[PDB]
Amino acid sequence: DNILYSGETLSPGEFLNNGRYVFIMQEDCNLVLYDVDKPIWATNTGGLDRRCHLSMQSDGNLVVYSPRNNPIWASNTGGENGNYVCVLQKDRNVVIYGTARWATGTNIH
Amino acid sequence: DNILYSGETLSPGEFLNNGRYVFIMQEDCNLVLYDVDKPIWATNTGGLDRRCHLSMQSDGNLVVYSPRNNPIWASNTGGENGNYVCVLQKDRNVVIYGTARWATGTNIH
Amino acid sequence: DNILYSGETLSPGEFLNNGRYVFIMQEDCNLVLYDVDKPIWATNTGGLDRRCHLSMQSDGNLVVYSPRNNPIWASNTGGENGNYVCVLQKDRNVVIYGTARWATGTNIH
Amino acid sequence: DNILYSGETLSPGEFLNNGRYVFIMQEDCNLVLYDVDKPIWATNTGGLDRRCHLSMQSDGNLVVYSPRNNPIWASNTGGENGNYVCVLQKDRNVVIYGTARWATGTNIH
Ligand SMILES: OC[C@H]1O[C@H](O[C@@H]2[C@H](O)[C@@H](O)O[C@H](CO)[C@H]2O)[C@@H](O)[C@@H](O)[C@@H]1O
Ligand SMILES: OC[C@H]1O[C@H](O[C@@H]2[C@H](O)[C@@H](O)O[C@H](CO)[C@H]2O)[C@@H](O)[C@@H](O)[C@@H]1O
Ligand SMILES: OC[C@H]1O[C@H](O[C@@H]2[C@H](O)[C@@H](O)O[C@H](CO)[C@H]2O)[C@@H](O)[C@@H](O)[C@@H]1O
Ligand SMILES: OC[C@H]1O[C@H](O[C@@H]2[C@H](O)[C@@H](O)O[C@H](CO)[C@H]2O)[C@@H](O)[C@@H](O)[C@@H]1O
Ligand SMILES: OC[C@H]1O[C@H](O[C@@H]2[C@H](O)[C@@H](O)O[C@H](CO)[C@H]2O)[C@@H](O)[C@@H](O)[C@@H]1O
Ligand SMILES: OC[C@H]1O[C@H](O[C@@H]2[C@H](O)[C@@H](O)O[C@H](CO)[C@H]2O)[C@@H](O)[C@@H](O)[C@@H]1O
Ligand SMILES: OC[C@H]1O[C@H](O[C@@H]2[C@H](O)[C@@H](O)O[C@H](CO)[C@H]2O)[C@@H](O)[C@@H](O)[C@@H]1O
Ligand SMILES: OC[C@H]1O[C@H](O[C@@H]2[C@H](O)[C@@H](O)O[C@H](CO)[C@H]2O)[C@@H](O)[C@@H](O)[C@@H]1O
Ligand SMILES: OC[C@H]1O[C@H](O[C@@H]2[C@H](O)[C@@H](O)O[C@H](CO)[C@H]2O)[C@@H](O)[C@@H](O)[C@@H]1O
Ligand SMILES: OC[C@H]1O[C@H](O[C@@H]2[C@H](O)[C@@H](O)O[C@H](CO)[C@H]2O)[C@@H](O)[C@@H](O)[C@@H]1O
Ligand SMILES: OC[C@H]1O[C@H](O[C@@H]2[C@H](O)[C@@H](O)O[C@H](CO)[C@H]2O)[C@@H](O)[C@@H](O)[C@@H]1O
Ligand SMILES: OC[C@H]1O[C@H](O[C@@H]2[C@H](O)[C@@H](O)O[C@H](CO)[C@H]2O)[C@@H](O)[C@@H](O)[C@@H]1O
Ligand SMILES: OC[C@H]1O[C@H](O[C@@H]2[C@H](O)[C@@H](O)O[C@H](CO)[C@H]2O)[C@@H](O)[C@@H](O)[C@@H]1O
Ligand SMILES: OC[C@H]1O[C@H](O[C@@H]2[C@H](O)[C@@H](O)O[C@H](CO)[C@H]2O)[C@@H](O)[C@@H](O)[C@@H]1O
Ligand SMILES: OC[C@H]1O[C@H](O[C@@H]2[C@H](O)[C@@H](O)O[C@H](CO)[C@H]2O)[C@@H](O)[C@@H](O)[C@@H]1O
Ligand SMILES: OC[C@H]1O[C@H](O[C@@H]2[C@H](O)[C@@H](O)O[C@H](CO)[C@H]2O)[C@@H](O)[C@@H](O)[C@@H]1O
C-alpha cells in the first residue's frame, strides 16, 4: 500500500500503489512509476543487474541495492538518523518525509 | 484515507481510517482514535464546543479550531514552513512527518 | 478488506472494513457491524461461546461456528453450490451476492 | 475502488483498481485489464469510437456504450432484474456476481 516505512524494503516485484498509480521495484533492477501502462519516471537502472531490492533507510536515504548489496542508485537524502516515510501520493508525486515530529504513541508490538 | 496532507482539513464528522483504526474529528469537538469501538487516545476537548475542524498546517502544527476559528488544542509542533503529512499508520500510531526531503516531481494540477 | 470470498473464513478477531465501517467476528462469538464505535447490527450470539469462526461457504450460506464446529447462527441462504461473495459496501449494507455469472478468466494460482 | 455496483457507470478514463491491477474504460473505447503495464484482457473495441461509457446494469449485463448510446460490446449476462456487482478481485479475475441473496439492511440514503 501507498507507504514504505523506514526500516522496510521492497523485494523484487514488490510495489506501492495508489489508485491507477504503481511504483515498482522491477526484477530487471529498474524502479519505475507507472500511470496505468505509461512510465512517467524511473531510476533508469534497467539491465544494470538482476533481483535488486529497494530500501527506505533510517538515515533518510532511499536506495536501490544489487543482490550483492552494492548501491546502484540513491536519492542522496542520507542525513539524520530517525523515522521516515516514502509516500506514493494521491496527486501522483512520490515524496520522502521525515523525521517524525509528533506521535500519539499508540503503536503495538 | 490514511493521510491528512498539509493544507487540508477535516470538517466535522470527517476521518482518517486504516483497517480497524479510525481517527475522527467528532462533532462534539473531541478528536479521537478508535480501535474498533474502543477509544485509545483523544484530545479530551469533548463538549468544549460544537462543529470544530481539524487543520494540518504548513507550519507543521496540527490544530483543532472552533467554528469561530480560535484554537482549542494543538500538537505544538509549529515550526518551519513546508510540506507535512499526518499519517494513521498500520501499527496504530498517528504520526506527523516533514518537511519533504526529496520528490520525483510528477504531481498534477 | 471489504470482501469475504466463498471458501474463506474469518478467525477470532478478524474483520472486514470499509471507511469508518467495521464488520468483525469478535472473540466472544458475537458478529457485529460498527459505524465507528456504534454497533448497528449483530448476530446477538455474544457469550454463547468463545473463539468462534465465520465461514462464507460455497453453498452460499454465511455461518458462525463454535470451536467444536457446531453452527450457532446462519444467514439461511444455503442453496446452490458455486462461488459467492459477502461484501461490506460503501453505503453501509452487508450483502451476499452469487453465483458468479461471468468472468474474464484471468485468475492466478 | 474494486467494485462497480449495478446502476453505476464508468465514464471515459474512470477505472477499477486492486493492488497492481487496473480495469479501465479507455477514451479510445477499449476496456482493458492491466497487470502493471501489461494488458492481460480487453474487449478489443479500441478505435471503434470515442468517449464510450461502461454500464453495470440492473438486468445483470455489463455493457460498453458509444456516446450515442448504442451498445458496442456486452457480457451477454442480461437476465433477471436485481442488484449485481462487478468485482476486480485480489486473484486478478474480474467477475460479475448476483442477484443479492441476503443483506443486513443497514444502508443509508
Ligand atoms: O532519463 C533522464 C531522466 O532524468 C530523471 O529522473 C531522474 C533519474 O531517474 C535518476 O537520475 O534519478 C534522479 C534522482 O532524483 C531522477 O529524478 C527525470 O528528470 C526524467 O524526466 C528524465 O527522463
Ligand atoms: O523487459 C523489459 C521490461 O519492460 C518494462 O520495464 C521497462 C524497462 O525497465 C526499461 O525499458 O525502462 C522502462 C522505463 O523507462 C520500463 O518501463 C516492464 O514491462 C518490465 O516488466 C520488463 O522487464
Ligand atoms: O549511514 C551510513 C549507511 O550506510 C549505508 O548507506 C549509505 C548512506 O545512506 C549514504 O552514504 O548513501 C549510500 C549510497 O549512495 C548508502 O549506501 C548502509 O550501511 C546503512 O545501513 C548505513 O546506515
Ligand atoms: O515516534 C514515531 C515512531 O514511533 C514508532 O517507532 C518507535 C521509535 O522509533 C522509538 O520509540 O523506538 C521504538 C522502538 O523500540 C519504535 O517503536 C513507530 O510507529 C514509527 O513508525 C514512528 O515514526
Ligand atoms: O486524559 C489524559 C490523557 O493524556 C493524553 O493524551 C494527550 C491529551 O490527549 C492532550 O493533552 O493532548 C496531548 C498531546 O500531545 C495528548 O498526547 C494521554 O497521555 C492519555 O494516555 C491520557 O489518558
Ligand atoms: O455523545 C457522547 C459521544 O460519545 C463518543 O464520543 C466520546 C466523547 O467525545 C467523550 O466522552 O470522549 C470519549 C473518549 O475519551 C469519546 O469516545 C461518541 O460516540 C460520540 O459520537 C458521542 O457524541
Ligand atoms: O505561523 C503562524 C500561524 O498562525 C496560526 O497558527 C498558530 C501556530 O501554528 C502556532 O502558534 O500555534 C497556534 C495554536 O496553538 C496556531 O494557531 C494560523 O494563522 C496559521 O495559518 C499561521 O501560519
Ligand atoms: O516537493 C514536495 C511537494 O510537491 C508538491 O507540492 C509543491 C510544492 O509545495 C512547491 O512546488 O509548490 C508547488 C505549487 O506551486 C506544489 O505543487 C506536492 O505533491 C506536495 O504534496 C509535496 O510535498
Ligand atoms: O435483537 C433483535 C435484532 O434483530 C436483528 O438482526 C437479526 C439478528 O441479528 C439475528 O436474528 O440474525 C438476523 C438474520 O438475518 C439478523 O438480521 C435486527 O432486526 C435488529 O434490528 C434487532 O435489534
Ligand atoms: O466485553 C463485552 C464486549 O463489548 C463489545 O461487544 C459487544 C458484545 O458482543 C454484546 O454486548 O453485543 C454488543 C452489540 O450488540 C457488542 O458491541 C466489544 O467491546 C467486545 O470487544 C467486548 O468483548
Ligand atoms: O451443504 C451442506 C453443508 O453442510 C454444512 O453446512 C450447513 C448448510 O449450509 C445449511 O444446512 O445450514 C447449516 C446451518 O444452519 C450449515 O451448517 C457444512 O457441512 C458445509 O460444508 C456443507 O457444504
Ligand atoms: O468463474 C468465477 C470464479 O473463477 C475463479 O474460480 C474458479 C472456479 O471456481 C472453477 O474454475 O474452479 C477453479 C479451480 O480449479 C477456480 O479457480 C475465482 O477467481 C473465483 O473467485 C471466481 O468466482
Ligand atoms: O482477441 C481475442 C481475445 O478473445 C478474448 O477475450 C474476449 C474478447 O475480449 C471479447 O470477445 O469479449 C469476450 C467476452 O466474454 C472476451 O472474453 C480472450 O479469450 C483473449 O484471450 C483473446 O486474445
Ligand atoms: O493510443 C493507443 C492506446 O494504447 C493503449 O491502449 C491499447 C489500445 O486500446 C489497443 O491497442 O489495445 C491495447 C490492448 O489490447 C491497449 O493496451 C493505452 O496506452 C491507451 O491509453 C492508448 O490510447
Ligand atoms: O432489459 C432491457 C435493457 O435494454 C438495454 O439493455 C440491453 C440488454 O441488457 C441486453 O439486450 O443486451 C443489450 C446489448 O447487447 C443491452 O443494450 C437498456 O435499455 C437497459 O436499461 C434495459 O434494462
Ligand atoms: O438488498 C440488497 C440491496 O440493498 C440496497 O438496495 C435496495 C434494494 O435495491 C431495494 O430495497 O430498493 C432499495 C431502494 O428504494 C435499495 O436501497 C443496496 O445496498 C444494494 O446495494 C443492495 O444490493
Boundaries of domain holding C99: 1-109
The rounded distance, in Å, linking the Cα atoms of B33 and B21 is: 7
Distance D104 CA to ligand 9 centre (A): 8
> Would the CB of B6 count as within 6 Å of ligand 7?
no
Cell of C87: 461484501
Cell of A14: 514488490
Size of interface A-D (CB pairs under 8 A): 30
The rounded distance, in Å, linking the Cα atoms of D62 and D77 is: 7
Phi, psi of B97 (to 5 degrees): -125, 140
Burial (0-12, 13-18, 19+ Cβ within 10 Å), B5 = middle
Method in brief = X-ray
Distance of CA B66 to CAs B14, B26, B49, B82, D43, Å?
Answer: 15, 12, 7, 24, 53
> Would the CB of D59 count as within 6 Å of ligand 15?
yes
Contact call for C22 and B20, based on CB within 8 A? yes
Instruction: Of A107, A105, A91, give the one whose Cα is nearest residue A2.
Output: A91
**Is the backbone peptide bond immediately before D99 cis, with ω within 30 degrees of 0?**
yes
The residue nearest atom 23 of ligand 9, judged by CA position, is C41
Is residue B3 less than 8 Å (CB to CB) from chain A?
yes
Contact call for C33 and D93, based on CB within 8 A? no
The rounded distance, in Å, linking the Cα atoms of D9 and C102 is: 18
| Number of domains making up chain C | 1
Resolution of the structure in the document, Å: 2.0
Instruction: Of A85, A61, A89, give the one whose Cα is nearest residue A75.
Output: A61
Residues facing B34 on adjacent strands? B22, B39
User: Which residue is associated with the grid cell 489508485?
Assistant: A19
Dihedral over alpha carbons D2, D7, D12, D18 (to 10 degrees): 0
Phi, psi of A17 (to 5 degrees): -140, 145
Residues sharing a CB contact under 8 Å with residue C85, sequence separation 6 or more, in sequence order = C3, C4, C5, C6, C56, C96, C97, C98, D85, D87, D97
Q: Which ligand is nearest to the CA of B103?
A: 8
> Would the CB of D55 count as within 6 Å of ligand 15?
no
Instruction: Of C93, C88, C100, give the one whose Cα is nearest residue C2.
Output: C88
Residues facing C25 on adjacent strands? C31
User: Which residue is associated with the grid cell 473495441?
Assistant: D45
Domain of B23, CATH number, reads 2.90.10.10
The strand order across the sheet containing D3-5 reads C100-103, D94-98, D84-88, D3-5
The pairing of beta strand C9-10 with beta strand C15-18: unpaired
Cβ atoms B41, B56 nearer than 8 A = no
- Quote the strand ranges of B1-109, DSSP E: 3-5, 9-10, 15-18, 21-25, 31-35, 38-42, 53-56, 62-65, 71-74, 84-88, 94-98, 100-103
N- to C-terminal Cα distance for chain D?
20
Is residue A22 less than 8 Å (CB to CB) from chain D?
yes
Is residue C41 less than 8 Å (CB to CB) from chain B?
no
The rounded distance, in Å, linking the Cα atoms of C1 and D105 is: 20
